[PDB]
Symmetry: D2
Subunit: 294 residues, 4 copies
């Protein structure tokens, strides 16, 4: 096979080492790790080489984007150029772009029939009481966002709390914001990692005693997971709907059933690899091998 | 006919008055002008009504988005909900979203065969000299952007100027940036306004004595325009490529021929309407009449 | 007398007209209104002229700073240069600078013996429950700030509300934040305007039905005020403590007595002038006349 | 002696270790290292304890502020509270605050007779040519700032370069900006470190081949320095003028003589300690011992 594979990222972290590793090992591929920010190119005379530190890049059979949440406009532009040059991407630019927008993505998942928690959208709602009654929740989660980021989640246990919180963020200097109801669960969500058409690995993320969260480390403790066939199907459908080749789907276990809470196009590998012992980076290179033309 | 038409904008300016005007006059349509930021809704149980100041909106046959460049994530979300409810939009969410990204849009136009000025893309280029030689320019225009905004253009007449400018912005706190070569022209660009499959109006925008620009009012003076059939074709193709129903295409007259410099999905009406006397707002309502189902 | 007076502000609003007016009328002074942002100067060879639109400014006997809350670093720099050139300022740079910092100012007022509401300071407090118990409040006001701005106030009626709010802002992307207890009062605060050593005018600002606020227009309705001699003394002491020549002091009427809530170095004139009929702009020019050397 | 010493900083870096080290070793002082952001307190009932992670801090004989450039408003507030509680600070709040403002500080140094390079100040100058002629430079350095930060320096070798650069930043989204002329020197500046009334250590910082800079590591290489008695006097006067107990003064060797380029209230220790072998952290604790009351 022997492919030249580029990896779009800003630095060297476990994920970056684990695939330089798995690509050099597996069918003896060459790997260059490029900062997207350091790429520069003529978007005009259509295609045209990509430049990096004064030299022309040599044509990659494939590109592995792993673009940061704060560099996603330029990142996807550079990604787009690689695509136009013939490189196969796991996760294509459009898909990556759209996925960063949690609003667009939640909308899309909902339209395609995927069970989410009931969720409200707002920015400067003008009648908070009506917004709270919509969504139904008396206890619910409010998630501040600002553009396409996320700068906070918070639980509002009472009506008044939910009121004061929304009224706080309403001062648009916090910008777009999301309401959805809290769970049974217990600060425990399941993170499935999809590569192509299968769930490749899956862990339970568990909260700490102080309120909830559950985030990777907002106090989070990982443990290996027992996914139901139903959860497995869902997490694969979610990625398919988002047109993501690699994705992290987070699932909450509600009484009514499993609910998708979020979908990531650049899931971290370390926690989930170390927890399960699964060679995820390898399943990714393997996927490239099945799909990239050389 | 009698349609209910919503207009998505944050305030009442000429454009907003001129179509409340033209819609109430023309086939007696009703019009509500809504702040997108004041809309709130359940993106979950797919579709679901849109709320505004404590009440449910009553279903619009059509929506005219005119979303601001700084509110485009939430704006398009609200737009998307109207679309999911059955409202026809002139300019659809996806198209609007993509168009805000000048990088993606320049790329797309270039791929589809549309003559642009030669243009470079960069963020933190690491070898400015190579970047300047690429693009070729010895005098060229550098356009700072930051996300999806634009916070400056500047002419660099010499190599050294172009160097110091790029090196200035390279400190990423300016983020993404665009290089392209300057013109003959003379601070004069042509702005065509496309509605559907025709150019509906067109003006010459003329710079002032102090350097160049030409911007609406960076010193700009408008006058009525004599578009060549070729320019006309191009400006229509550009909008088609971008999948925009209404668009402002800006064209520079180079020796080699007309070049598209920019495409806007929310062109201002005042300057161009007053300059030409053309009823543009009416051609927009008319377009809705030909395409919205009631 | 005949002074040349400069006014540092970014535009022409009532305040700006009302003193061009009162200075040309009163002892026939000349007035130039300058954008601080348009001033440029050598901070080196100590003193040195200030340049404005290509020319050297002609030496002002006095400067009236009215610098915006978002331009206060450069504004005060330009102010400082005028001071170094010999111009008398009503409100000096240091005083203006310090006053913009509500934290430093609240601290200072408290140290000097001036009754404030009980007030807590926090940024990323780590134990919200302890923070709420400190301050004592079960209902209290949380005021988000971010640098030196203010981007929100909110009432938290219960413990849980106060919790969810603080936890929301704790995500430092909101930065510094202030807790203090709510009042009897009733959305009514008294705004006194101090010029030199007297309160020159004073209005009642009254909230609307929807929650509280009281802000100028967050729904605010003004009416003429009956200040107690005690309130009068306090508002004069506050300005003295802050070393402000002109200041807006806001006072809340608590059971225990009058409490200073805020001190502004650039109070607006329109609402308070129109409400009372007092010639405030004139008392300001008069103050300059008593203190500037010609 | 035996003092309790608090160190205000956000994390554990060499500087933070080297004084936990030197304070526990030297006259057996106790040391707590506190995040300023985690402090919370009643700025009202004047003084009042400082809270940290749910508990009351136990009263420090001294505080060593080492506050970050992006947290300086809240940092100095917390600092101020310690001061009000009786703790001696090396570097007091006012001094630290003022020092962060490079504009105010450059002004002050200039007024007090300290030779700087000739320096211009601007934000949106309206006539760049006049600004460049002022300052005199044909080659000069332009330093972008934005509030109180610094987000770039750049050399402009020609008039045109200097023009395009200033015109670029003029789009206020870059905000305040500084012009001063370039040097002989050669990317080499001298950094002196003042503790109290002496220069305690001093290094040469040397640029790399690619343009200039010289910054700690913008390519910087350190080497031990031979300060003239004159340079020594100056660096001590600068700190005295700024009322800083500990400061980093940077000096450029011009033909006309040594020029102060910058003064820092929180100089890094690592580069300069390792380069010279001097126990700087110890001279700081020693200074506290000579000045703090127990
Ligand atoms: N609607 C909800 N109900 C219950 N728990 C939630 C809800 N939303 C978020 N959480 C918890 O808070 C944590 C933070 O969620 P979020 O930041 O939205 O996703 P992620 O964990 O992917 O960053 C999650 O891991 C989850 O356990
Ligand atoms: N590559 C170029 N060559 C010559 N002139 C240009 C170039 N780019 C921009 N200009 C001039 O500068 C003005 C500012 O352009 P820009 O801000 O990119 O577009 P818009 O005018 O749509 O805001 C334009 O009207 C144009 O006349
Ligand atoms: N601690 C408090 N108790 C009661 N009412 C308050 C309190 N703080 C603020 N308010 C009300 O909210 C309004 C907003 O206050 P703020 O924005 O801090 O001051 P300003 O009115 O000077 O902008 C005030 O006019 C006041 O009436
Ligand atoms: N006016 C000047 N002339 C020559 N060299 C300069 C000038 N200003 C800055 N430099 C060089 O550029 C580097 C960056 O300077 P700056 O960022 O202002 O200070 P610091 O090095 O303290 O961060 C300096 O170390 C200095 O060597
Ligand atoms: N959220 C949209 C999809 C957005 C998109 O296709 O880009 C939907 O309901 O289908
Ligand atoms: N710029 C891309 C198109 C982007 C898109 O389709 O969203 C191209 O070359 O086709
Ligand atoms: N807040 C400080 C005063 C701040 C200052 O003097 O700048 C005090 O308690 O005195
Ligand atoms: N730069 C001012 C000093 C500023 C201050 O004292 O705070 C001067 O020329 O003295």
């Amino acid at each position: 096979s022997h492919m030249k594979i580029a990896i779009l990222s800003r630095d060297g972290t476990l994920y970056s080492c684990k695939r330089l590793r798995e690509a050099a090992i597996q069918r003896g591929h060459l790997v260059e790790i490029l900062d997207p920010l350091s790429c520069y190119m003529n978007i005009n005379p259509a295609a045209s080489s990509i430049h990096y530190k004064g030299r022309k890049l040599p044509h990659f059979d494939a590109v592995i984007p792993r673009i940061g949440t704060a560099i996603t406009f330029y990142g996807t532009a550079a990604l787009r150029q690689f695509e136009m040059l013939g490189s196969y991407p796991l996760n294509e630019s459009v898909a990556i772009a759209r996925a960063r927008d949690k609003l667009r993505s939640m909308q899309l998942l909902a339209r395609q029939g995927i069970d989410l928690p009931v969720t409200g959208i707002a920015h400067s709602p003008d009648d908070t009481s009506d917004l709270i009654d919509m969504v139904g929740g008396a206890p619910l989660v409010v998630k501040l966002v600002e553009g396409t980021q996320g700068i906070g989640v918070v639980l509002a246990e009472t009506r008044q709390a939910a009121e004061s919180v929304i009224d706080a963020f309403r001062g648009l200097n916090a910008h777009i914001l999301v309401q959805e109801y809290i769970k049974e669960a217990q600060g425990c969500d399941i993170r499935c990692l999809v590569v192509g058409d299968e769930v490749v690995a899956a862990i339970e993320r568990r909260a700490k005693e102080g309120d909830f969260r559950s985030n990777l480390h907002r106090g989070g403790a990982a443990s290996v997971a027992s996914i139901t066939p139903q959860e497995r199907e869902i997490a694969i459908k979610a990625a398919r709907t988002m047109a993501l080749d690699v994705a992290g789907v987070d699932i909450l276990r509600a009484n009514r059933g499993p609910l998708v809470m979020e979908v990531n196009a650049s899931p971290g590998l370390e926690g989930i690899e170390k927890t399960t012992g699964i060679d995820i980076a390898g399943k990714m290179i393997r996927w490239i091998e099945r799909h990239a033309t050389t």
